[PDB]
Structure 1
């Protein structure tokens, strides 16, 4: 939640420039992934080998998405003032998502 940091107008513009500078922006849990999960779950046995293959399948896409996310967050962190960084870091310590 960047919005509780009292972002300056300059910082709001800088965030826009960062988010345009790293926009993917991917959709919400691909239907294909869900359908593969569905096939594993709605079966009379749990197929662990099949499940492992399903879990691994989008590893490349996850890597690209998570790299973009982390780089974006790092860029935003670095436009913050020392006061804002302390608040961001305190908030980080309390959340688990």
Structure 2
């Protein structure tokens, strides 16, 4: 992402990235303990991990989604000469 953007662009991104972080709630505070709990055990059991993971589906699905909305929206702030250069770096 270095397409010689203008002094209007970066700030428009600023409004959407603050839409990509906050409102789009990222942290469940007790599950980051769970991961710890399963790894920090001397005896490993898959089902304990299998059934923690998929509780982290609602959160990680709704994220991937929300993120794509925002990164699309920045694409749409671009110009034809800028959209060009961005597309090609993906390759």
TM-score grouping bracket, smaller chain normalisation:
0.7 to 0.9
CA distance in 1, matches of 2:69, 2:86: 16
Over residues 12-53 of structure 1, what are the superposed CA-to-partner deviations in whole Å (9 max), with x where a residue is unaligned? 343234335555256876553332112111223221111111
CA distance in 1, matches of 2:87, 2:38: 39
Higher helix share: 1
Aligned length: 91
Q: Normalized against structure 1, the TM-score is what?
A: 0.69
CA distance in 1, matches of 2:84, 2:19: 25
CA contact (8 A) 2:24 2:66 kept: no
Matching of residues 18-57 of structure 1 within 5 Å: 18-21=16-19, 23-24=21-22, 31-57=29-55
Q: CA RMSD in A?
A: 2.7
Summarize the Cα distance change of 1:43–1:13 in structure 2 as closer, same or farther, 3 Å threshold: closer
CA distance in 2, matches of 1:28, 1:89: 28
Over residues 47-90 of structure 1, what are the superposed CA-to-partner deviations in whole Å (9 max), with x where a residue is unaligned? 11111111111221222222221100001111212222222223
Q: Normalized against structure 2, the TM-score is what?
A: 0.73
Which ranges in structure 2 are unaligned for 5 or more consecutive residues?
Answer: none
Which ranges in structure 1 are unaligned for 5 or more consecutive residues?
Answer: none
Q: Secondary structure at the match of 2:26?
A: coil
